[PDB]
Amino acid sequence: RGSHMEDFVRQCFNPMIVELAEKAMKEYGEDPKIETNKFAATCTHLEVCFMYSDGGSKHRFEIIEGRDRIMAWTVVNSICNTTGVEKPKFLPDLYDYKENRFIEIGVTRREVHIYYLEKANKIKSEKTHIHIFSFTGEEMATKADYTLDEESRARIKTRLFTIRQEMASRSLWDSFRQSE
Ligand SMILES: COc1cc(CCNC(=O)c2nc(Cc3ccccc3C(F)(F)F)[nH]c(=O)c2O)ccc1O
Numbered sequence: 001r002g003s004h005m006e007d008f009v010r011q012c013f014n015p016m017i018v019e020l021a022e023k024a025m026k027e028y029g030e031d032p033k034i035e036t037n038k039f040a041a042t043c044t045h046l047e048v049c050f051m052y053s054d055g056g057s058k059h060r061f062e063i064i065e066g067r068d069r070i071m072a073w074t075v076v077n078s079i080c081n082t083t084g085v086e087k088p089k090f091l092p093d094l095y096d097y098k099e100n101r102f103i104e105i106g107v108t109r110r111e112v113h114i115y116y117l118e119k120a121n122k123i124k125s126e127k128t129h130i131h132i133f134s135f136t137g138e139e140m141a142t143k144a145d146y147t148l149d150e151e152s153r154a155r156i157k158t159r160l161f162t163i164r165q166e167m168a169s170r171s172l173w174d175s176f177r178q179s180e
Pocket residue numbers: 028045065090091092093104105106107122
């Protein structure tokens with residue numbers, strides 16, 4: 001199907017990020033040409049996770065998001081057997097070696113409060129850190145511990161708002177906001 005959203009996602013995001021989002025959606029049994037809003041969402045989430053890992057020290061983060069499910073769970077099991085942190089019931093996004101905790105990164109189109117509430121209700125181990133961003137420039141982290149420096153998060157919010165602006169300029173932001 002000829003979707004403007006698909007072409008915009010391919011023009012906006014990095015090709016390797018697009019390939020990773022495509023592989024993730026195909027592994028989860030979703031059509032990137034049909035679920036174009038979910039395609040944009042997966043690309044955005046991947047890019048935000050990569051920018052997050054880009055912040056901090058060189059060996060600070062172990063990246064779980066992006067890998068296929070089997071290898072991702074393998075790295076999670078290795079981290080749990082190495083450090084001793086409780087195994088999470090759901091696949092997280094990163095692991096902070098400095099703070100020694102799993103990080104779940106979320107990107108929302110609504111208020112960060114509701115999104116964080118749903119995520120804290122989903123995750124039951126509580127030991128997993130949750131860091132939520134929004135397309136309006138807001139953020140919320142567990143225990144007010146935002147992990148990274150202010151600049152590394154500020155560039156993330158800037159990129160999110162740029163993506164929102166481009167979506168609105170292409171007249172696709174309304175359906176993308178209604179999709180969530
Ligand atoms: C069983 O469902 C889950 C699967 C996973 C492992 C892989 N998916 C993510 O890692 C992840 N997916 C999403 C959005 C999404 C997209 C597809 C299905 C379900 C969901 C969610 F349910 F999350 F809305 N947003 C994240 O930020 C994000 O990290 C983790 C937690 C889950 O509850």
